[PDB]
């Protein structure tokens, strides 16, 4: 079947009726299956709309509105799946049009209801018995209203059952694994499959890429497994499409996900934290002649993770500047910068909200690359702020440029840091001048935590350490991991407390896991299938030769097999 993309422009009219139609034709010319929604709109009168006859199937919704053309020959449209809805919960919508809508082959609507209103020239359609088409679940939302001038039309041939027909002529008058009638009882006798399809055979789901192997308790990849490209199953996704995280092919990757490439097939892995977004710094491109982050441009930094260029925060931002017509920046909006991890240029901070204590907004900043430097000198400059600690706890590298920190009368710590450990370029130097005296900081316990190493701290809390005295639970330094005790039970990997698998029972006066997996803990907390402390036995998971493998419980909570007879589980 020939495939086109579909449309979701709704009631919009793209330019001239000619330009609109010309692009409508371009989309659906010679098209058999519509992957998206079908939208026929603003079609002029006496327009050759006979090309619509090719369309056999629609995945999304069908919208026909604002048309004055006499005929709309959807003569071979067999099925509307209704994977998306136009408005409310309609799969088919015919609104404010049109004389002839001969949908003689429309046998099944898999999901959604139907709407007819304001079609003063429509004929015959009001006689169709929708109960044979729409699933009884969608009946409750049906909205059928046919009304015309007087409604003078042609009459259904007597051949028709109960006088129900789409138009003139006698030509206008199964079950499992199917949804478009049948030419007999089988998988193959279907003009349109139900759930999915693969080489004439209909199915409930495409053969899963991976299958459970009771002969090993491990997961093995079924070579007789295909993806799912819309309603069909494909051995390999078509061109430019990409594999989701549940087997299907799709055009481009999700918003909370990104594209990788295992072997040759391009796949979609979920983003580890906020997906990467590179944005332009100050004094470049979108902001070539901008002086700093102001009230105007700050919003363009939303969702940014990387910055190509520099980042300026000057007094003018908080004052506002009339000459450029830009208000005084609201300091709260600086939180937008919380998602930035990388700065390729330099970071300059000559201003900062007085009521804030540290450079909170950069608590996640990891690297300053200093490819560009202030006065060709500074990669990081923090000057004359009121802040008490810097708070760059995620900062792990300043690869080039000099670091200048001065005039912050209240700034403690800072000198506690070994900046060499961050530097990567030779000759990088640090000027830490005219801040809060060390002895003054001692006087008020403004001192690195006992749980910090001697490498210093970005602040007073234990999460502010450079490195940890003993070990680290996430971002925090701690005395010891939850070995034996503790609510979340843990094991140590590289001086770093790691959480035991959830489905592992704690233990009295003894450890409760050895590794990150379920096959690495003494006693299960729920069930047990082989080495794997599972939370619930596998009951229904497919395996080799397509056989639903079931498993039962036990008094000892061990997952035992069920007799091959049981097809629903013991």
């Amino acid at each position: 079947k020939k495939v086109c993309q579909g449309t979701s422009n709704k009631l919009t009219q793209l330019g001239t009726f000619e330009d609109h139609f010309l692009s409508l034709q371009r989309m659906f010319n010679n098209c058999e299956v519509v992957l998206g929604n079908l939208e026929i709109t603003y079609v002029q009168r006496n327009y050759d709309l006979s090309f619509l006859k090719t369309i056999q199937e629609v995945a999304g919704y069908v919208l026909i509105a604002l048309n004055t053309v006499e005929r709309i020959p959807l003569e071979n449209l067999q099925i509307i799946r209704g994977n998306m809805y136009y408005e409310n919960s309609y799969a088919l919508a015919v609104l404010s049009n049109l004389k002839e809508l001969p949908m003689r082959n429309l046998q099944e609507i898999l999901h959604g209801a139907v709407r007819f209103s304001n079609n003063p020239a429509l004929c015959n359609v009001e006689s169709i018995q929708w109960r044979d088409i729409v699933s009884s679940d969608f009946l409750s939302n049906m909205s059928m209203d046919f009304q015309n001038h007087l409604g003078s039309c042609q009459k259904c041939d007597p051949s028709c059952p109960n006088g129900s027909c789409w138009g003139a002529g006698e030509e206008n008058c199964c079950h499992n694994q199917c949804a478009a009638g049948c030419t007999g009882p089988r998988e193959s006798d279907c003009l349109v499959c139900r759930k999915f399809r693969d080489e004439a055979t209909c199915k409930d789901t495409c053969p899963p890429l991976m299958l459970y192997n009771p002969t090993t308790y491990q997961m093995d990849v079924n070579p007789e497994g295909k993806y799912s490209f819309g309603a069909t199953c494909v051995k390999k996704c078509p061109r430019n499409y990409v594999v989701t995280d549940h087997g299907s092919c799709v055009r481009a990757c999700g918003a909370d996900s990104y594209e990788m490439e295992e072997d040759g097939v391009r796949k979609c892995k979920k983003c580890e934290g906020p997906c990467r977004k590179v944005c332009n710094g100050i004094g470049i491109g979108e902001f070539k002649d901008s002086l700093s982050i102001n009230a105007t441009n700050i919003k363009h930094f939303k969702n940014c993770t990387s910055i190509s260029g520099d980042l300026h925060i000057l007094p003018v931002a908080f004052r506002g500047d009339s000459f450029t017509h830009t208000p005084p920046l609201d300091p709260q909006e600086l939180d937008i910068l919380k998602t930035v991890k990388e700065i390729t240029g330099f970071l300059l901070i000559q201003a900062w909200p007085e009521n804030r204590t540290d450079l909170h907004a950069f608590e996640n900043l990891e690297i300053i690359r200093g490819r560009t430097k202030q006065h060709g000198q500074f990669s990081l400059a923090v000057v004359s702020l009121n802040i008490t600690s810097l708070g760059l706890r995620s900062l792990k590298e300043i690869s080039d440029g000099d670091v200048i920190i001065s005039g912050n009368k209240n700034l403690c710590y800072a000198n506690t840091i070994n900046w060499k450990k961050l530097f990567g370029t030779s000759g990088q130097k640090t000027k830490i001048i005219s801040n809060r005296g060390e002895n003054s900081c001692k006087a008020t316990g403004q001192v690195c935590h006992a749980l910090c190493s001697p490498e210093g701290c970005w602040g007073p809390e234990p999460r502010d350490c450079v490195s940890c005295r003993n070990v680290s639970r996430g971002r925090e330094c701690v005395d010891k991991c939850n070995l034996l005790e503790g609510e979340p039970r843990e094991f140590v990997e590289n001086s770093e407390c790691i959480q035991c698998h959830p489905e592992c029972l704690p233990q009295a006066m003894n450890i409760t896991c050895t590794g990150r997996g379920p096959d690495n803990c003494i006693q299960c907390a729920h069930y047990i299938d082989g080495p794997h402390c599972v939370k619930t036995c596998p009951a229904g998971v497919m395996g080799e030769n397509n056989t639903l493998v079931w498993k039962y419980a036990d008094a000892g909570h061990v997952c035992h097999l069920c007799h091959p007879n049981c097809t629903y589980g013991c």
Partner: nanobody, 116 residues
């Protein structure tokens, strides 16, 4: 205090190169620089161009940290100068990918030139 002593051979040193990426480049005598290869140190991923695709087998070694480039089956096409570069990659960066522009690398070697 990051260093790349090069001669292939390219001894990395200066920082714990977790989530770093190290590769090689080609300096045309009558043109601009050009990518060659690259590899992540925190996961044995690699990436070549097409001109040397499969021709080279550059990988890591034992302990931190050296990166070699087995230039087997050398063709008279790669007539240029080789360089050795390194860079850090942020957590938001794809843990499967590799930058290719020279711009994307912060530390560079002193250029070695071999002729066969």
């Amino acid at each position: 205090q990051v260093q790349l002593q090069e001669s292939l051979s390219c001894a990395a040193s200066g920082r714990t190169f977790s989530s770093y990426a190290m590769g090689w480049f080609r300096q045309a005598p009558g043109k601009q620089r050009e990518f060659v290869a690259a590899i992540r140190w925190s996961g044995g991923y690699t990436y070549y161009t097409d001109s040397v695709k499969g021709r080279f087998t550059i990988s890591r070694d034992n302990a931190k940290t050296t990166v070699y480039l087995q230039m087997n089956s050398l063709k008279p096409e790669d007539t240029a100068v080789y360089y050795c570069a390194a860079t850090y990659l942020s957590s938001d960066y794809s843990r499967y990918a590799l930058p290719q522009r020279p711009l994307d690398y912060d530390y560079w070697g002193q250029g070695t030139q071999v002729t066969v």
